[PDB]
Amino acid sequence: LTDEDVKMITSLSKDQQIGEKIFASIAPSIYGHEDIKRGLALALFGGEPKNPGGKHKVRGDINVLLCGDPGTAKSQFLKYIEKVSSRAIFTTGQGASAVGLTAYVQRHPVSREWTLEAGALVLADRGVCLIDEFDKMNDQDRTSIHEAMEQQSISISKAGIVTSLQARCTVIAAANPIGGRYDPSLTFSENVDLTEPIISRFDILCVVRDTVDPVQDEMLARFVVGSHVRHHPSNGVEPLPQEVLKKYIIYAKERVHPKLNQMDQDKVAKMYSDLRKESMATGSIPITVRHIESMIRMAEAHARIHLRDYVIEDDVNMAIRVMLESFIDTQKFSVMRSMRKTFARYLSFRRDNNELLLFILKQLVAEQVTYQRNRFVPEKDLVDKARQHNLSAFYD
Amino acid sequence: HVSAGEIDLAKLKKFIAYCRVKCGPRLSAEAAEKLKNRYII
Amino acid sequence: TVRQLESMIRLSEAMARMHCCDEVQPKHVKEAFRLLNKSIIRVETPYCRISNLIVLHLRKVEEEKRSELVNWYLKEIESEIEEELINKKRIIEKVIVLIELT
Numbered sequence: 373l374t375d376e377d378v379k380m381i382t383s384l385s386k387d388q389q390i391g392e393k394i395f396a397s398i399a400p401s402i403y404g405h406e407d408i409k410r411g412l413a414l415a416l417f418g419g420e421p422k423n424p425g426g427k428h429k430v431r432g433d434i435n436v437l438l439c440g441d442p443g444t445a446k447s448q449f450l451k452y453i454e455k456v457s458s459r460a461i462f463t464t465g466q467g468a469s470a471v472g473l474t475a476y477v478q479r480h481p482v483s484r485e486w487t488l489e490a491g492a493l494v495l496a497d498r499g500v501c502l503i504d505e506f507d508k509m510n511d512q513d514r515t516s517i518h519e520a521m522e523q524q525s526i527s528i529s530k531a532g533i534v535t536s537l538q539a540r541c542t543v544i545a546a547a548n549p550i551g552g553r554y555d556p557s558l559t560f561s562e563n564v565d566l567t568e569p570i571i572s573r574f575d576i577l578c579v580v581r582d583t584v585d586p587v588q589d590e591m592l593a594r595f596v597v598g599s600h601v602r603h604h605p606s607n608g609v610e611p612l613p614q615e616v617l618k619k620y621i622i623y624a625k626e627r628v629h630p631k632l633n634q635m636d637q638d639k640v641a642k643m644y645s646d647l648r649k650e651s652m653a654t655g656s657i658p659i660t661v662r663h664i665e666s667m668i669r670m671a672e673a674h675a676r677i678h679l680r681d682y683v684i685e686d687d688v689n690m691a692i693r694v695m696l697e698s699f700i701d702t703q704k705f706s707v708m709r710s711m712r713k714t715f716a717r718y719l720s721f722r723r724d725n726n727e728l729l730l731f732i733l734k735q736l737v738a739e740q741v742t743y744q745r746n747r748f749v750p751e752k753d754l755v756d757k758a759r760q761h762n763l764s765a766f767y768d
Numbered sequence: 769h770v771s772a773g774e775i776d777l778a779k780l781k782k783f784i785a786y787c788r789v790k791c792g793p794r795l796s797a798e799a800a801e802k803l804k805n806r807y808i809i
Numbered sequence: 810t811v812r813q814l815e816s817m818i819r820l821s822e823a824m825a826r827m828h829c830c831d832e833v834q835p836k837h838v839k840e841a842f843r844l845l846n847k848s849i850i851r852v853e854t855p856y857c858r859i860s861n862l863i864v865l866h867l868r869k870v871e872e873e874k875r876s877e878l879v880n881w882y883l884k885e886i887e888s889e890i891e892e893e894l895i896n897k898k899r900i901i902e903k904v905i906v907l908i909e910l911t
């Protein structure tokens with residue numbers, strides 16, 4: 373189905389800004405959340421499954437978990453991924469979904485036919501399962517999702533059916549924190565209301581925090597009101613068109629298979645050892661080989677995004693940045709800020725040095741505004757934090 | 769992740785099955801004596 | 810949350826529909842916002858202590874032994890306005906960390 377498509381997508385790949393173009397093209401109706409969109413792009417393009425011999429299966433699926441307080445467009449992200457991805461099935465932790473997580477065998481209500489209704493984990497064997505309300509799942513649903521994520525298989529022993537059928541889906545889950553408000557004081561594991569084994573099987577953990585930020589609120593309100601105005605019934609790169617993005621995904625998943633021959637084992641091992649040392653230097657969740665494997669998966673995903681067929685050092689650095697950002701956000705504030713300061717080298721990769729300065733300015737002005745709102749910024753503070761040299765570019 | 773004198777998986781399965789079906793061992797007298805003394809200690 | 814903005818939009822549309830106007834107006838949106846704001850109610854718990862707590866925490870974070878620091882706090886906040894020092898010490902004693910959010 374891709375002839376002139378395949379003609380043009382190669383040129384788009386050589387465009388050399390295709391990664392940013394895709395990351396901006398994901399969820400055109402959702403404002404902000406660049407990190408979430410980047411993670412979703414990596415998940416959409418997936419990794420490279422492998423199995424040394426036939427005895428050490430390792431998944432090539434990048435699982436994502438958006439844990440966030442209400443009003444953060446997690447449902448919209450899941451719905452957009454449903455719309456874009458092929459073989460994308462939307463299931464909910466409640467009982468109000470067309471499909472369910474657990475497989476059963478029964479006579480169909482309509483077909484009146486004795487059918488083995490496999491779960492929403494199996495109906496996306498080579499696709500994406502969008503599990504909304506991931507925190508409100510039954511015991512059987514939790515066990516089914518555990519089995520699928522850890523084994524990629526679903527075992528039925530129901531009537532006379534003793535079978536084990538494969539469900540190799542990529543799980544994109546949406547969840548709310550305990551109490552309906554994420555608290556960085558506590559860690560992600562004790563904020564999310566999920567079991568640690570369940571959490572571990574997720575490559576990306578997006579903490580979608582909501583804060584009262586003047587500029588963000590104004591821009592989001594502008595976006596929402598504009599969408600309403602233009603959809604009223606009486607009627608920095610350019611995003612790719614959605615159909616072109618779909619075909620790009622098809623080609624990237626079908627043909628290019630990135631290989632890991634050229635990756636700095638020394639650099640990555642040093643990073644892993646340093647992360648472990650810093651992990652037990654404070655009272656935080658340690659990093660594990662699981663994280664380096666997830667970083668490998670994300671590096672393969674970036675290589676697939678750029679059709680490289682080989683993971684390049686920039687791909688490895690971007691995968692490391694995603695893995696770090698996630699692992700850091702999973703920590704409590706006390707250790708989160710410490711690790712961010714210690715490993716700012718990795719976190720700052722592929723940052724033009726304007727976003728960092730803008731965030732520093734935003735935090736300074738937020739401190740000032742919270743001071744003022746209760747009681748009733750200088751160039752020096754900004755330059756000091758920059759030292760922690762060029763502000764003309766940021767000002768202009 | 770990059771690469772992806774022993775026994776392969778299927779051969780190991782078959783070897784385990786054959787050993788289980790064929791051989792059921794028993795402890796010897798001296799082996800039992802040593803095991804008893806070590807267990808007492 | 811943005812759901813409140815969506816509800817405000819719906820309420821303004823409802824006001825316009827009530828008045829049979831084909832386009833919402835400043836008055837309609839103002840009434841919708843007023844209704845939403847009045848509907849949301851202030852929690853009452855058994856109240857100005859939080860202001861002192863957050864200001865002193867902000868000062869500490871900006872700074873980032875008890876003998877020196879307690880007096881530092883007892884002097885700093887009184888730089889803008891004799892009976893309130895004991896109240897300040899009382900709230901400090903009630904408070905008496907790495908994991909804390911303002």
Ligand SMILES: Nc1ncnc2c1ncn2[C@@H]1O[C@H](COP(=O)(O)OP(=O)(O)OP(=O)(O)O)[C@@H](O)[C@H]1O
Nearest residue numbers: 401402403442443444445446447448595596811812
């Ligand atoms: N970043 C955003 N940009 C644009 N619209 C947004 C954004 N965040 C939320 N919205 C809109 O605000 C409303 C809230 O979004 P939505 O219903 O998806 O919430 P949610 O994250 O699924 O919430 P919950 O977890 O409570 O169910 C919707 O109208 C959504 O379109």
Ligand SMILES: [Mg+2]
Nearest residue numbers: 446447448546
């Ligand atoms: Mg939702």
